[PDB]
Amino acid sequence: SMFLPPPECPVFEPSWEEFADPFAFIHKIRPIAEQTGICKVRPPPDWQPPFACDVDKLHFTPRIQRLNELEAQTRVRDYTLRTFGEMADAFKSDYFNMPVHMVPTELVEKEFWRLVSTIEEDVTVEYGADIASKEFGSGFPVRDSPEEEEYLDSGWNLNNMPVMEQSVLAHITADICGMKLPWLYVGMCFSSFCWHIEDHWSYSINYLHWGEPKTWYGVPGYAAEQLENVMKKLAPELFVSQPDLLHQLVTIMNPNTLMTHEVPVYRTNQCAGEFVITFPRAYHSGFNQGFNFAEAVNFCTVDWLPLGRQCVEHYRLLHRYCVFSHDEMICKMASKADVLDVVVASTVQKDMAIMIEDEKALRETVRKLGVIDSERMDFELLPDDERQCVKCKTTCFMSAISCSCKPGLLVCLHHVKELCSCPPYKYKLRYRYTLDDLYPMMNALKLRAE
Ligand SMILES: O=C(O)CNC(=O)C(=O)O
Ligand SMILES: [Mn+2]
Ligand SMILES: [Mn+2]
Ligand SMILES: [Zn+2]
Ligand SMILES: [Zn+2]
């Protein structure tokens, strides 16, 4: 009546054979898990990476969080892990007037949703979210016995997933620190993460190292726009376009609201030693049951490539900033075709064929607008902020239009009419590759793939 919990998401318990390769496993579960957005993976019972750290030497600056449904929050003092933990336990213990392990998870969940709905209640909490630095540090072992060395090179060690052969993000040489370095999340009771999807609609994978559970809600990829439509109606303030990457607006929203509007929603409690995986464009949110320590990272498989391209197109329509150029990633991999995995090479080839055919058509269109002059340009050398379309903010790589009347400004080939009021004959087509350069790059991939 008050809170009706969503149905449980899938839980997987892979054998050690299945667990050996994450990407094969993730590919295996995808048909199930993509229908629910999120899933939970329990490793085999003896897969137990050692957590070790000094609670007095780990220092961080907490974010403060007000707990109000539909209120705007932006997506991205000082505590030690010890002093945070003391604050966190005391908070929950006083809130419920009980010892922490006695507080049932169903009650914290019920109470979270009551609390965020009531305006008279104005509970604020704190949490930690930051990338590993020399102060933060991964919860997994890194280089700085057979078992303790095993965890160093495990695929499920989240330092390795991004820079493994099979994250297409591995091959990016651009700075994308938010997207291949793990994030560390130090939770307390009710600290929450707002509804979101990952940058470039990537996967995320999250491991709870220790402490009390993290409660998750997830929506499958196919329902993303339904969720957004429900959200736009209840909170249009969140949909006013953002002036930069560091101003993304997100919110807490009761999954029963979504379920009322027939958006499918699933839940889980992730406990210590369990993984949650979010699939491309799968909206998720949640909150911590209490004091805990999690670590998460983005990644991209071969299954993701075409969604990556759709995502960049969707960003263009919304005028949203990109973290990296997708076309630049594809060409970088083409230029390394000899050393790519052959299934990777095969999938890159297929995305590259679409890129080339779209680029060919776009160039024909701008030639017919009267843009005649052209010059090669190494777009990858420009900082990002010097190669965004004035109009749609897309990060340019394949091509752009410039005019000497506005030095340094560019539009992509969709926005040729948006640069300035000079006639198009004054413009230059700036291009990274001729069509004749591109066909042999794609062919190198074909050869690698057999
Ligand atoms: O754990 C959190 O607090 C937030 N994590 C995520 O959004 C994720 O892992 O994709
Ligand atoms: Mn409130
Ligand atoms: Mn996330
Ligand atoms: Zn544009
Ligand atoms: Zn001009």
Swiss-Prot record:
Domain JmjC residues, every copy: 150-316
Zinc finger regions, C5HC2: 389-441
Binding site for Fe cation: 196, 198, 284
Domain JmjN: 9-50
Cellular location(s): Nucleus
Tissue: Ubiquitously expressed, with highest levels in testis. Down-regulated in melanoma and glioblastoma. Up-regulated in breast cancer (at protein level).
Record-listed 2-oxoglutarate binding positions: 127, 204, 206, 214
Disease affiliated with this protein: Intellectual developmental disorder, autosomal recessive 65: A disorder characterized by significantly below average general intellectual functioning associated with impairments in adaptive behavior and manifested during the developmental period. MRT65 patients have moderate to severe intellectual disability, developmental delay, and facial dysmorphism. Camptodactyly is present in some patients.
Domain remark from Swiss-Prot or TrEMBL: Both the JmjC domain and the JmjN domain are required for enzymatic activity. However ARID and PHD-type 1 domain are not required for activity per se but contributed to recognition of the H3(1-21)K4me2 substrate peptide.
Quaternary assembly: Interacts with FOXG1B, PAX9, MYC, MYCN and RB1. Interacts with HDAC1, HDAC4, HDAC5 and HDAC7. Interacts (via PHD-type 1 zinc finger) with histone H3 unmodified at 'Lys-4'; the interaction is inhibited when histone H3 is methylated at 'Arg-2' or 'Lys-4'.
Role noted for this protein: Histone demethylase that demethylates 'Lys-4' of histone H3, thereby playing a central role in histone code. Does not demethylate histone H3 'Lys-9' or H3 'Lys-27'. Demethylates trimethylated, dimethylated and monomethylated H3 'Lys-4'. Acts as a transcriptional corepressor for FOXG1B and PAX9. Favors the proliferation of breast cancer cells by repressing tumor suppressor genes such as BRCA1 and HOXA5. In contrast, may act as a tumor suppressor for melanoma. Represses the CLOCK-BMAL1 heterodimer-mediated transcriptional activation of the core clock component PER2.
Family: Belongs to the JARID1 histone demethylase family.
Name the UniProt record assigns to this protein: Lysine-specific demethylase 5B
Organism the protein comes from: Homo sapiens (Human)
Lineage: Eukaryota, Metazoa, Chordata, Craniata, Vertebrata
